[PDB]
Design an enzyme around this catalytic site. Structure first.
Site, PDB file in Angstrom:
ATOM      1  N   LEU A  13      70.113  64.289 103.898  1.00  0.00           N
ATOM      2  CA  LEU A  13      71.019  65.446 103.988  1.00  0.00           C
ATOM      3  C   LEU A  13      71.779  65.595 105.294  1.00  0.00           C
ATOM      4  O   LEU A  13      72.851  66.202 105.329  1.00  0.00           O
ATOM      5  CB  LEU A  13      70.213  66.706 103.784  1.00  0.00           C
ATOM      6  N   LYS A  17      69.094  66.140 116.438  1.00  0.00           N
ATOM      7  CA  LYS A  17      69.074  65.615 117.821  1.00  0.00           C
ATOM      8  C   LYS A  17      67.828  64.727 117.998  1.00  0.00           C
ATOM      9  O   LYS A  17      67.817  63.715 118.753  1.00  0.00           O
ATOM     10  CB  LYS A  17      69.088  66.788 118.833  1.00  0.00           C
ATOM     11  N   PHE A  18      66.796  65.100 117.238  1.00  0.00           N
ATOM     12  CA  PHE A  18      65.488  64.414 117.252  1.00  0.00           C
ATOM     13  C   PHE A  18      65.285  63.526 115.994  1.00  0.00           C
ATOM     14  O   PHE A  18      64.613  62.509 116.082  1.00  0.00           O
ATOM     15  CB  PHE A  18      64.366  65.473 117.422  1.00  0.00           C
ATOM     16  N   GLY A  19      65.916  63.858 114.853  1.00  0.00           N
ATOM     17  CA  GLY A  19      65.682  63.082 113.597  1.00  0.00           C
ATOM     18  C   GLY A  19      66.378  63.451 112.276  1.00  0.00           C
ATOM     19  O   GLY A  19      67.128  64.430 112.234  1.00  0.00           O
ATOM     20  N   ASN A  20      66.150  62.630 111.232  1.00  0.00           N
ATOM     21  CA  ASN A  20      66.730  62.851 109.859  1.00  0.00           C
ATOM     22  C   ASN A  20      66.105  63.932 108.983  1.00  0.00           C
ATOM     23  O   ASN A  20      64.899  64.054 108.895  1.00  0.00           O
ATOM     24  CB  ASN A  20      66.696  61.642 108.980  1.00  0.00           C
ATOM     25  N   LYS A  36      62.359  67.426 107.474  1.00  0.00           N
ATOM     26  CA  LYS A  36      62.883  66.845 108.702  1.00  0.00           C
ATOM     27  C   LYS A  36      61.816  65.857 109.233  1.00  0.00           C
ATOM     28  O   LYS A  36      60.643  66.274 109.419  1.00  0.00           O
ATOM     29  CB  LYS A  36      63.264  67.834 109.755  1.00  0.00           C
ATOM     30  N   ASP A 130      73.021  79.727 120.841  1.00  0.00           N
ATOM     31  CA  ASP A 130      73.980  78.687 120.439  1.00  0.00           C
ATOM     32  C   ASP A 130      74.488  78.971 119.046  1.00  0.00           C
ATOM     33  O   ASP A 130      74.626  78.112 118.202  1.00  0.00           O
ATOM     34  CB  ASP A 130      73.379  77.300 120.568  1.00  0.00           C
TER      35      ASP A 130
END
Ligand SMILES: CCN(CCO)CCCOc1ccc2c(Nc3cc(CC(=O)Nc4cccc(F)c4)n[nH]3)ncnc2c1
Lengths: 271, 43
Positions: A13, A17-20, A36, A130
């Site tokens: 999907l 920043k760290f993974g899929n 995730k 953010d």
């Protein structure tokens, strides 16, 4: 408890920043979620364990219809897995880019949802830091979901000094090196409302120096197509002085929001 | 891409899930979690 073998894996999907992230179905319940997947040795080599931990801590303890849920999490020899709410309509940013700009109903709706979610956060002394389209997903009926808490902090007493967020969204006080508090999220809400309605953020320039100058001067130039109500709300959020910004309850009560929002709360589990 | 995960099979399941939400606080929020302190240690 959970292992990867408890889920049918559908398809990827997104990044992160760290993974899929993957579409997944928990086999027992046939319940559709997202997973995730993070690699432990990558995280350790980047030095980001503590940062990831704090993100999990914040997201996993928030329960709101407009905040993407973290159901649970698990790990094996090589990976950490975060069990997340699936957002069937996907990335808000993709939708804004496809349409160019949102209409007043869609914008007001999203603002009411944002303000309710953010007020939930602030009541718990969580600052987001953010807010921008790229950090928002959409539910089955288009509902806003705050998805990413990468810059977030639990700040129960102390003012903060970290410069964080995204160039076009930075509040004056960040740029000026002042301490900041939860009222940064008010400013970012105002930037977001303008970007939803106009399709570009208010302080857009090709130089970072010029953008910072426009921000600290609050050099707001409203296009003429905007309604008086929308301008009124944006103007009340984009105040130089944090204490003068419209509170989040004030956004939810603003007449432009009341007149234009079509917010619907999702169905909830019933005994 | 298995069948469940695209097209109308997905659409119907999503709709279904929206209007018949499960008790996720019990089904998932009740199950043990690894200690955050332990996520980078042995499973
Ligand atoms: C209109 C159909 N579209 C077509 C797509 O081809 C959209 C289909 C659905 O698209 C998506 C995209 C991204 C999603 C998505 N992304 C996501 C979830 C998150 C939360 C997250 O990663 N949390 C987290 C918490 C602590 C630590 C950490 F590293 C991350 N970030 N990004 N989550 C859920 N559903 C999604 C649905």
């Amino acid at each position: 408890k959970f292992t990867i073998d408890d889920f049918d894996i559908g398809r990827p999907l997104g990044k992160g920043k760290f993974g899929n992230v993957y579409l997944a179905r928990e086999k027992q319940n046939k319940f559709i979620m997202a997973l995730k997947v993070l690699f432990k040795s990558q995280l350790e080599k980047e030095g980001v364990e503590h940062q990831l931990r704090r993100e999990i801590e914040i997201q996993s303890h928030l329960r709101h219809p407009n905040i993407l849920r973290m159901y649970n999490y698990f790990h094996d020899r090589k990976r950490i897995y975060l069990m997340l709410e699936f957002a069937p309509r996907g990335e808000l940013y993709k939708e804004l880019q496809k349409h160019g700009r949102f209409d007043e109903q869609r914008s007001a709706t999203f603002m009411e949802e944002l303000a309710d979610a953010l007020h939930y956060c602030h009541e718990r002394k969580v600052i987001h830091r953010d807010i921008k389209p790229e950090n928002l997903l959409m539910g089955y009926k288009g509902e806003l979901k705050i998805a990413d808490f990468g810059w977030s902090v639990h700040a129960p007493s102390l003012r903060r000094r970290t410069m964080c967020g995204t160039l076009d969204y930075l509040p004056p006080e960040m740029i000026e090196g002042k301490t900041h508090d939860e009222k940064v999220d008010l400013w970012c809400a105002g930037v977001l409302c303008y970007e939803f309605l106009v399709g570009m953020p208010p302080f857009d320039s090709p130089s970072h120096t010029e953008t910072h100058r426009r921000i600290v001067n609050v050099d707001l130039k409203f296009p003429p197509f905007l309604s008086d109500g929308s301008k009124d709300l944006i103007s009340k959020l984009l105040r130089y002085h944090p204490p003068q910004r419209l509170p989040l309850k004030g956004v939810m009560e603003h007449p432009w929001v009341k007149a234009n929002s079509r917010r619907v709360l999702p169905p909830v589990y019933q005994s | 891409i298995p069948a469940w995960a695209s097209g109308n099979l997905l659409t119907q399941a999503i709709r279904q899930q929206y209007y018949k939400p499960i008790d996720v606080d019990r089904m998932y929020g009740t199950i043990d979690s690894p200690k955050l302190e332990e996520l980078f240690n042995k499973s």
